[PDB]
Ligand binder design. Structure first.
Ligand SMILES: CCCCCCCC[N+](C)(C)CCCS(=O)(=O)[O-]
Lengths: 232, 224
């Protein structure tokens, strides 16, 4: 379970998942595989006493964290490690890794939704594993590298804008059956160099259910945390 | 009213006011509604070494804060109505003044405010001496407890044939004094807008995390 949720998806496959929100009575979110045994993967929920959004992610309904800025438009996904700012003598191997960053900006072009999203993730090795990014302090990290435009050995991804349908008068994307309700928060994330390889897809299927389907190089923790950053 | 003017604006809303000047001139802030509703009054003291505005919730006289310039006249601090610690050090801590905002002019403007708690209230900054304060922290680059804001640069508009911003109808007159204050991370969330609509009338519209006293004092700092 712990190993599965951190492993990049096998090459050539799509890992298809159901994400459920529980708003009864902050809301709880759950990820399960979208089979008919529906194995539990991940739970997430916002911490109560927190100044900005902080979701704690676990494999019991503690494996990572999603942290927001105050403006609610720049996110980092961490693993379970320690924050270097809390003590400089902390063992380097125990410091938290940055698994993803997510940047939301308002669109300058019309006809592709209110928001653009950029996803920065670590690069991959020859053995198809992540090359970890494990900052020793403030001055480095995925969002900092994005801001300084130093994305050298990182992977950058964006939301796919919808395409004018040729005879039928729509800006659309083919979600391959994984959307049941139209929603401004449905999305496909792609690499700019291949618009047809859908690295992450998030689709609404009911009031509190969504599809979440991921491919290499993402793992479930990264996929889940990126989907969570899309909620208000 | 004393509560209202210190309360951060409700999240998701914009509090729309009208600022007027009686032309040392007097300044007045009203809610921008069909019936005027009074919020704040301010006036420069005549006999200060540097610029000092007193701010009240009574336009006839309820003392609520102050706006104090530095020596050069390019940096300002906004205080609530508490005591200055330099005047009496045995003074109870709960009675000492708090720093609500600071403004630095180069015009390019930098606005520094206290940060907010998990309950959406200010984390107060209440120095015991002048080794601490908004401007001290900002100049030492220790901004963890604070929020840093700047005026938004104007952009080319083809229609108008000028560098301007979309003030949404709230400006009628072009002016060097017209501004929008934003955070670096989001140029579209307008924390404070100030705009001219006549010779001695302006709009002043604020959003969370600001309260009216921070908003009005920030605007007063832009005059001289
Ligand atoms: C400079 C501090 C601003 C405080 C954060 C405000 C949060 C803004 N959002 C992302 C939660 C949305 C703004 C509210 S809206 O949608 O009504 O403009």
């Amino acid at each position: 379970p712990r190993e599965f949720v951190l492993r990049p998806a096998p090459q050539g496959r799509t890992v298809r998942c159901r994400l459920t929100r529980d708003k009864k009575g902050y809301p709880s979110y759950f990820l399960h595989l979208d089979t008919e045994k529906k194995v539990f993967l991940l739970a997430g929920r916002k911490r109560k006493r927190s100044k900005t959004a902080n979701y704690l992610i676990s494999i019991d309904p503690f494996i990572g964290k999603l942290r927001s800025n105050l403006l609610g438009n720049r996110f980092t996904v961490f693993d379970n490690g320690q924050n270097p700012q809390r003590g400089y003598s902390t063992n380097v191997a125990s410091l938290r890794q940055e698994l993803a960053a997510v940047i939301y900006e308002t669109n300058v072009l019309g006809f592709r939704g209110p928001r653009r999203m950029t996803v920065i993730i670590p690069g991959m090795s020859a053995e198809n594993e992540r090359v970890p990014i494990r900052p020793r302090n403030a001055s480095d990290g995925l969002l900092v590298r994005w801001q300084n435009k130093t994305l050298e050995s990182l992977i950058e991804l964006h939301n796919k804008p919808p395409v004018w349908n040729d005879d039928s008068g729509s800006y659309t994307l083919n979600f391959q059956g994984r959307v049941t309700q139209a929603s401004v928060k449905n999305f496909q994330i792609v690499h700019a160099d291949d618009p047809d390889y859908i690295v992450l897809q998030f689709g609404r299927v009911a009031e509190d259910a969504f599809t979440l389907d991921y491919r290499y190089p993402l793992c479930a923790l990264q996929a889940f945390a990126i989907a969570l950053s899309s909620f208000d």
